[PDB]
A paper describes a structure:
Here we report crystal structures of the full cytoplasmic region of CpxA, a prototypical HK involved in Escherichia coli response to envelope stress. The sensor kinase CpxA senses a variety of envelope stresses, including misfolded proteins, and transduces this signal to the RR CpxR through conserved phosphotransfer reactions. The full cytoplasmic region of E. coli CpxA (CpxAHDC), encompassing the HAMP signaling domain (residues 188–237) and the DHp and CA domains of the catalytic core (residues 238–457), has been produced as recombinant protein for structural studies.
In some crystal forms, however, only the C-terminal α2 helix from both monomers could be traced in the electron density maps, because CpxAHDC has a tendency to establish interactions via its central-core helices, leading to the formation of dimers-of-dimers that sterically interfere with the positioning of helix α1. When considering together all CpxAHDC crystal structures, it transpires that the DHp helical bending promotes a strikingly different dynamic behavior of the two CA domains in the homodimer, primarily due to distinct interactions with the central four-helix bundle. In all homodimers, the fixed CA domain is sequestered by the DHp domain in an inactive kinase conformation, with the ATP-γP positioned far away from the phosphorylatable His248.
Numbering used by the authors:
A (entry chain B): 223 to 407, 416 to 455
B (entry chain A): 220 to 407, 416 to 456
The structure:
């Protein structure tokens, strides 16, 4: 009865927040659908215009961001409820191997100087895997020729350091580095989701000067005790 | 053992809400960029081709979306905190301060507030801050829109509490009786807005309705279920 009342109250709060997001999406998509209908009618008729193609593609990009809001929000629930103990080397082995392949295809190099060990972590494996994958792919794009990935552990947590030889980053640019949600280079995700996912696992992220000349991204995650 | 597990639930759900609030704030900020590119494309098209019913329509839809994004940005900046913790509370203790502050506000405005049917010690279960702000918002709206007076009535039965807020204002047209609760509604502050009032009431398994008031203006009805031990 009371355990049941607590479970019902928690779900009721979660569902009402999801209904509000969903209702915000329905309102935004009312003018967007009218706009997409107007565009389609014009495009079907006066069909060869760079401006009309631009309006359609931007309307679709706006629509994808709204879809991201709904998908990524229902998914942040999954990270909260779906958690397990995992070892750092088993968690990120595939990401580091796929990144080494991506580096090779690009004509760049990835060096894992300090490899991960069987260090226990607690959280959502998919979210922690994609957070490192995102920063590593960011280094693969920004780097001139090389990227380096280092793992360190102490009694309290795991430090992941991602370095690149990309252009020197200004302290101002470094301070706002985790602010963009989308990649400026739908749209691919920027580094805001990385900070979000890491803070959700009670860790932190920092942007610093890299010894290789480019950007240094530092992830800290607590050890599972 | 069970406490540690239950507290691990609540704190994980608290971290989830922090990340969902950040996500809403982030995406709200990103929406403007394709919209301005779309508005530039529309402005250019109007120069190249002439006046068009379709182009004029795209333009009025892009402006409506711009207003909604402005409103979504303000909504994303004023998100509520500690929304998870629930407790048993009595209706009179919950809303006493709101009704007293409203009586003072009415006096300052040169208007009158009458609580004809006062709240009793009726048990509710949920978030006090959300339930308090929900009534505060509808009462502060009645104060703002009323011509001279507002009335607040509380009724209880075996299943729930009915709160009726009346004003002698211009009211709300039948066409917008449900529309005023939609995010970003505008006719074209007193609080977080009517969409956030309906969310707070529906999370407590209640409902809100807009009706004709015997006072001539708007009647807002809130229904909330009783907490049953
Ligand atoms: N008591 C009322 N009388 C008349 N109109 C009302 C009343 N309460 C709300 N409304 C209408 O509903 C709209 C949405 O309400 P609300 O979200 O609380 O305020 P806001 O104007 O800040 O968006 C108001 O702008 C107004 O047009
Ligand atoms: Mg108002």
């Amino acid at each position: 009865a009371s355990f049941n009342q607590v479970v019902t109250a928690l779900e009721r709060m979660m569902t009402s927040q999801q209904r509000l997001l969903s209702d915000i999406s329905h309102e935004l998509r009312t003018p967007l659908t009218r706009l997409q209908l107007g565009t389609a009618l014009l495009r079907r008729r006066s069909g060869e215009s760079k401006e009309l193609e631009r309006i359609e593609t931007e309307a679709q990009r706006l629509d994808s961001m709204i879809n991201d809001l709904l998908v990524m929000s229902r998914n942040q629930q999954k990270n909260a409820l779906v958690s397990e103990t995992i070892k750092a080397n088993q968690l990120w082995s595939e990401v580091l191997d796929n990144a080494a392949f991506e580096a090779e295809q690009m004509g760049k190099s990835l060096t894992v100087n300090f490899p991960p060990g069987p260090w226990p972590l607690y959280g959502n494996p998919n979210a922690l895997e994609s957070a490192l994958e995102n920063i590593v792919r960011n280094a693969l794009r920004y780097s001139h020729t090389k990227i380096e990935v280092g793992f360190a552990v102490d009694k309290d947590g795991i430090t992941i350091t991602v370095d690149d030889d990309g252009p020197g980053v200004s302290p101002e640019d470094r301070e706002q580095i985790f602010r963009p949600f989308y990649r400026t280079d739908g749209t691919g995700l920027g580094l805001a989701i990385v900070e979000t996912a890491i803070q959700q696992h009670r860790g932190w992220v920092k942007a610093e000067d890299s010894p290789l000349g480019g950007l240094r991204l530092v992830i800290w995650l607590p050890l599972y005790k």
